[PDB]
Amino acid sequence: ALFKEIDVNGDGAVSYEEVKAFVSKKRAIKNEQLLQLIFKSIDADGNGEIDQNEFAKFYGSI
Amino acid sequence: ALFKEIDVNGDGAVSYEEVKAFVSKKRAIKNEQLLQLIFKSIDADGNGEIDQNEFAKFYGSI
Amino acid sequence: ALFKEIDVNGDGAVSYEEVKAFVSKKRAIKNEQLLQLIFKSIDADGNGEIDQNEFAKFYGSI
Ligand SMILES: [Ba+2]
Ligand SMILES: [Ba+2]
Ligand SMILES: [Ba+2]
Ligand SMILES: [Ba+2]
Ligand SMILES: [Ba+2]
Ligand SMILES: [Ba+2]
Ligand SMILES: [Ba+2]
Ligand SMILES: [Ba+2]
Ligand SMILES: [Ba+2]
């Protein structure tokens, strides 16, 4: 449950400092998750890296 | 006065480095201030922490 | 070329870690570049710093 994720110390309470620590790491993730998506959207062969011809395709008109 | 806040060293000038340091800490505050607001909006008893039943209320439909 | 900027190590590939490092430093720049613009927009004499009377002008109605 979401509460148990935030209430890190596990004492049934969520301190401000904890909410804050969560609120941020939540945001910190759809960043990593979006970028990853954007990435693999470019890396076609899922080989781990983008070469010139993938980067080439990705950009431009038509 | 706002100028005296930014011109930290107090020499009548505001360097870029200072504006920058201010511009950021200004932003750094409505973050803390908004979240705090959001927080105490959830913590009903203002006891310092949110328990399950407050978190319970906060979320959901109806 | 943009690719050579990102592919820092210069091995023809762009790792995620690199894209990420780029994506951020790109963003990190229009920040510095916008603020600088805003700054020199205030510093009229381009002397390096804003005095009271420039800051005075900058603010307000009429
Ligand atoms: Ba706790
Ligand atoms: Ba893929
Ligand atoms: Ba590839
Ligand atoms: Ba100064
Ligand atoms: Ba309250
Ligand atoms: Ba409470
Ligand atoms: Ba590389
Ligand atoms: Ba100027
Ligand atoms: Ba000046």
Numbering used by the authors:
A (entry chain A), B (entry chain A), C (entry chain A): 4 to 65
Would you copy out the relevant sentences from the publication that reported this structure?
In this work, the flexibility of the EF-hand motifs are examined by crystallographic and thermodynamic studies of binding of Pb2+, Ba2+ and Sr2+ to Calcium Binding Protein-1 from Entamoeba histolytica (EhCaBP1). EhCaBP1 has four EF-hand motifs, each of them able to bind one calcium ion similar to that of calmodulin. The overall structure is trimeric in which EF-hand 1 of one molecule interacts with EF-hand 2 of the other molecule in a domain swapped manner to form an assembled domain similar to that of the calmodulin N-terminal domain. Thermodynamic studies confirm that EhCaBP1 has five binding sites for Ba2+ compared to four binding sites for the other metals. These structures and thermodynamic studies reveal that the EF-hand motifs can accommodate several heavy atoms with similar binding affinities.
In CaM, Ba2+ has low binding affinity for EF-hand motifs compared to Ca2+ For EhCaBP1 also, Ba2+ has lower binding energy compared to Ca2+, even though the difference in binding energy is not very high, therefore it cannot replace the calcium at low concentrations. Hence, the EhCaBP1 was denatured and refolded in Ba2+ containing buffer. The overall structure of the Ba2+-EhCaBP1 complex, including the coordination geometry, is similar to that seen in the native structure, except for a couple of features The coordination distances in the EF1 motif are on average 0.1 Å longer in Ba2+-EhCaBP1 than in the Ca2+-bound structure. This difference suggests that the EF-hand motif is flexible enough to accommodate metal ions of varied size. Moreover, a significant difference occurs in the EF2 motif, where two barium sites are observed. One barium is located at the same site as calcium The extra barium is in the close vicinity of EF-hand 2 loop, with partial occupancy and coordinated by residues K43, D46 and D48. Both barium ions in the EF2 motif seem to be partially occupied, according to analyses of temperature factors and difference Fourier peaks. Before placing the heavy atoms, the fully occupied barium ion site had difference Fourier electron density at about 10σ and partially occupied barium ions has about 5σ level, clearly indicating the occupancy level. Our work has also provided the first successful example of replacing Ca2+ with Ba2+ in the EF1 motif of a calcium binding protein.
